[PDB]
Each structure stands twice: as C-alpha cells, then as structure tokens.
Amino acid sequence: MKKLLFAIDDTEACERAAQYILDMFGKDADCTLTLIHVKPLYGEAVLAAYDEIEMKEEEKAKLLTQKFSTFFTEKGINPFVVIKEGEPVEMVLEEAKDYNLLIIGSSENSFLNKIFASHQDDFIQKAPIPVLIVK
Amino acid sequence: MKKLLFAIDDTEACERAAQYILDMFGKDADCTLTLIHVKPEFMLYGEAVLAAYDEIEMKEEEKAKLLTQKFSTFFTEKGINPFVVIKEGEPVEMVLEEAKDYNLLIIGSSENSFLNKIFASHQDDFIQKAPIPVLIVK
Known part of the structure; x- marks a missing residue:
C-alpha cells in the first residue's frame, strides 16, 4: 500500500493539490491518503486569551479537516485524518517518516x-521521503 | 492520459527517482512517461581545446546516448515504453519549457x-518557476 500524506491548508493552492491527488491517485486501489493538520505564550495579553485561542484552533482544525475529508469522500477516497499539535512544519516532517509521498500546496x-x-x-532536504509540490 | 516528464541525469538520485516512478505509477495504464536529457552548451578551457577537441565533443554525444539507453532499458524491462527527448541548451530553461505540456515533472535531487x-x-527558484506540479525524489 502506497501511503500518501497531504499537509492541508486553507489556501487555493491546497484546493488545487486536493484535486490533483484525486486526478492522479483516485483510481489507485493500492493507495491510502492521510490528511494532516497541526494545531500551532508570552505576555499578559497572550496568557489571558489562552482558552479562547485553544478553542478557536480546535474548531478551525475540525472544520478544515472536515472540508478536505468531504471533498475526497464524495469522490471515492476515504482518507485518514491526523490532527497533531506543535510547530506545524516540524510535526509534518516528523509524521512523513511513516509515508511514501508528502504532498504540499505552495x-x-x-x-x-x-x-x-x-x-x-531546507524543507525538501529535511523531508524523509519524496515531496510533491503543487502551486 | 496523465503525462509524466522525468528529467534524467547521471546520479544515484535519478536512479532512485526511476524506481520510485515504477513503484508509484508502474501499474497505471493511463500514464505516459517521457524522459528528457539536455546537453549543455559548449564551453571549454583553451588547454582542453588543444588537448582533446575532437574527443570531448564525441564524449558529450556518448553521454546522451548512454544515459537515454540506460533509462530506456530500465523502464522497458519493467513493461513501460517511454518517449525520449534530447535537447541542447541551458538545462534549467529547457526542462521548464518542456514541462508546460505535461502533468507531472519528476527530478532526482x-x-x-x-x-x-x-x-x-x-x-x-526552480520550484517556483515550474509550470506544473513537481515531484522531488531524494
């Protein structure tokens, strides 16, 4: 099984990436798709907003992953979803270790x-696996 | 038909890219594969012009033949009959121009x-200039 990891984002380039995955891999039986989204404190102002920010991010994560999941599931791909927390780029590269292709929208x-x-x-140099870049 | 363009070089990274193409797209009957090699434009030192003019030009044509034969063999033995394009010019410019007519560009880093x-x-810059999606294999 070819494992694809797609780092989703709320951009038009990621929308084109989603369509491109479908066009390129949608008829492939030996293929799984995983959508990853990463949920991203100094000063009184930032500290007081902590709870509102954590709530906003959880909500954004659910909505974005559902939007990309719905896009695929109505077109014959049942993707996996991985929601992580940490520094987005580092967490994506770390997750990629267990996959065969990393897809990003630039x-x-x-x-x-x-x-x-x-x-x-150094993103491409540090990626543990091949990287597909869609604009 | 989804058109793959694979820029071939004399690197182990390119060997890895070729195998990866097979692994990811090999069973796909709606793919065409085109191999591209670009011969660089003539520049030599004067010492080399005097020492070896005839045989450096000959060796440069042999590189193109040997590379395209190597990768043509690799794919044909695994059931893929690729198209093969050889250009001469500035490799980066030539590959990017050719890429306009394809669905995926694959390069070994x-x-x-x-x-x-x-x-x-x-x-x-190369990634930002690419007219189509690019797949980079390490």
Missing part, C-alpha cells in the same frame, strides 16, 4: 511560509 | 543533477 499564504515557520531554507 | 545543486526548499 503559495505565499501557505502555513509553510509563515514568518515563524521552520525549515524555510 | 543531487548536487550533480542538471541543476548542479540539490533542492533545498519549497521556496527554491
């Missing part, structure tokens, strides 16, 4: 390119 | 690739 608004996202200089 | 540098990041 765009300016990608979680990969956030100001504080890790591995912006 | 290596310091010795046609790019002469390993892929480091998704932010890499």
Whole structure:
C-alpha cells in the first residue's frame, strides 16, 4: 500500500493539490491518503486569551479537516485524518517518516511560509521521503 | 492520459527517482512517461581545446546516448515504453519549457543533477518557476 500524506491548508493552492491527488491517485486501489493538520505564550495579553485561542484552533482544525475529508469522500477516497499539535512544519516532517509521498500546496499564504515557520531554507532536504509540490 | 516528464541525469538520485516512478505509477495504464536529457552548451578551457577537441565533443554525444539507453532499458524491462527527448541548451530553461505540456515533472535531487545543486526548499527558484506540479525524489 502506497501511503500518501497531504499537509492541508486553507489556501487555493491546497484546493488545487486536493484535486490533483484525486486526478492522479483516485483510481489507485493500492493507495491510502492521510490528511494532516497541526494545531500551532508570552505576555499578559497572550496568557489571558489562552482558552479562547485553544478553542478557536480546535474548531478551525475540525472544520478544515472536515472540508478536505468531504471533498475526497464524495469522490471515492476515504482518507485518514491526523490532527497533531506543535510547530506545524516540524510535526509534518516528523509524521512523513511513516509515508511514501508528502504532498504540499505552495503559495505565499501557505502555513509553510509563515514568518515563524521552520525549515524555510531546507524543507525538501529535511523531508524523509519524496515531496510533491503543487502551486 | 496523465503525462509524466522525468528529467534524467547521471546520479544515484535519478536512479532512485526511476524506481520510485515504477513503484508509484508502474501499474497505471493511463500514464505516459517521457524522459528528457539536455546537453549543455559548449564551453571549454583553451588547454582542453588543444588537448582533446575532437574527443570531448564525441564524449558529450556518448553521454546522451548512454544515459537515454540506460533509462530506456530500465523502464522497458519493467513493461513501460517511454518517449525520449534530447535537447541542447541551458538545462534549467529547457526542462521548464518542456514541462508546460505535461502533468507531472519528476527530478532526482543531487548536487550533480542538471541543476548542479540539490533542492533545498519549497521556496527554491526552480520550484517556483515550474509550470506544473513537481515531484522531488531524494
């Protein structure tokens, strides 16, 4: 079984990536798809918002994973979902160790390119498996 | 038909990419595979022009033959009859231009690739210039 890991994001590039996976792997029987989303404290203001922020992120994680899950399940793919927490980029690369292909959507608004996202200089070099980049 | 374009080089990374293509797309009857090799433009030192002019040009054509034969054999023995394209020019420009007419570009990442540098990041210029999705094999 070929294990695909798709790092989802709320971007149009990830929407194109989802369609592309379907176009390229949708008729493949020996193939599973896993959607990964990673839920991402200093100063009084940040500390007081902690609970509201944690709630917002849990809600965002559920909605985004459901949106991508529904996209696939109505078109013949029953994906797995993995929701992690930590630094998004590091957690994606760590999860990828157990898969055969990592798929990412690349765009300016990608979680990969956030100001504080890790591995912006070496992502492909650090990836333990092949990487498919869709724009 | 989904059109795969595979840029071939004389690297172990490219050997890994070829096998990965077989593993991921080998059983797919709606795939075509095209191999591309780009011969670089002529530049030599004067010392080499004097010492070996005839045989460096000959060796450069032999590289193209030997590479395309190696990968043609690899795939044909596993049931895939690939198309083969040989260009001459600036490899990066040539591969990216050819890629416009395909569905997936596959490259083995290596310091010795046609790019002469390993892929480091998704932010890499080559990745950003690619007109189609790119699959990078390490």
